[PDB]
Amino acid sequence: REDRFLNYFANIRWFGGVPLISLGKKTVKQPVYIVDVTKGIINAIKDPDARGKTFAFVGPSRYLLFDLVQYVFAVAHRIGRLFEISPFEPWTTRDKVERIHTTDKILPHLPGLEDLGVEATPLELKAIEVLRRHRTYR
């Protein structure tokens, strides 16, 4: 609901909506859903025998496309900061812009999520919830 990476998109009401960076090469990474994250911990908290055997979190099916950025504006139809405003909680034109566009689908020999089951969530069903813009009905 209230992460930074998916809310980095659609908070870009601007004089230009550019992807990163006008290219559909590496997009995207593996957006695992947040219920699967909290479900992996509670199974492992008395698993047993899960010490040292580090685990990896599978995402959805399967890699992902450039369509995601077009998927934002299609369906959206185009906490202790301060008393007034924080002076610097920016979009950070620095190494922030590259920490997500470096996908690295890593080694599948980690067990790491389906064995710490059961976590299976698509993207197309949970996308209605988090996105919220001016139409709200159609």
């Binding site: 301060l82 008393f83 924080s86």
Partner: protein, 152 residues
């Protein structure tokens, strides 16, 4: 800094100088608050104005007894409040639901729904310990906004 931390002795003073409360009259604890509005223990003009629209509130007050037919309607009004809010519930039936406590259709606590900060006990708290609870609340505001972004 001595310069910056001097400022929140105005702002965290100003919010504890003008509170615009909502009251939810549901049961017999509503009637005693009206006598606090009656000018013996005159509730107005000790920092705090009378009733107000549901939009412009800071301190909501749940009084009386909650039923399961009111548990949705409480949360929706609780969402519409702005951010520096506080919940203070009077009445012994807002702290565990008094007795009626073992009944099939009474919200157990008025704490498993909203997060509440100050608990006044009693079938009717006699509009004598309740101004004492409000001066407890302004005493609770010793918080800071500077040295929060100035620390982290």
């Amino acid at each position: 800094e001595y310069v910056v931390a001097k400022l929140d002795d105005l702002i965290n003073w100003a919010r504890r100088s003008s509170l615009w409360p909502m009251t939810f009259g549901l049961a017999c604890c509503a009637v005693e608050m009206m006598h606090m509005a009656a000018p013996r223990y005159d509730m107005d003009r000790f920092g705090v104005v009378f009733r107000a629209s549901p939009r412009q509130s800071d301190v909501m007050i749940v009084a009386g007894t909650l039923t399961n037919k009111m548990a949705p309607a409480l949360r929706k009004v609780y969402d519409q409040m702005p951010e520096p809010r506080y919940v203070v519930s009077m009445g012994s039936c807002a702290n565990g639901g008094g007795y009626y406590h073992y009944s099939y259709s009474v919200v157990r606590g008025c704490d498993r729904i909203v997060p509440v900060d100050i608990y006044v006990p009693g079938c009717p708290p006699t509009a004598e310990a309740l101004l004492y609870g409000i001066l407890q609340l302004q005493k609770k505001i010793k918080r800071e906004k500077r040295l929060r972004i100035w620390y982290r």
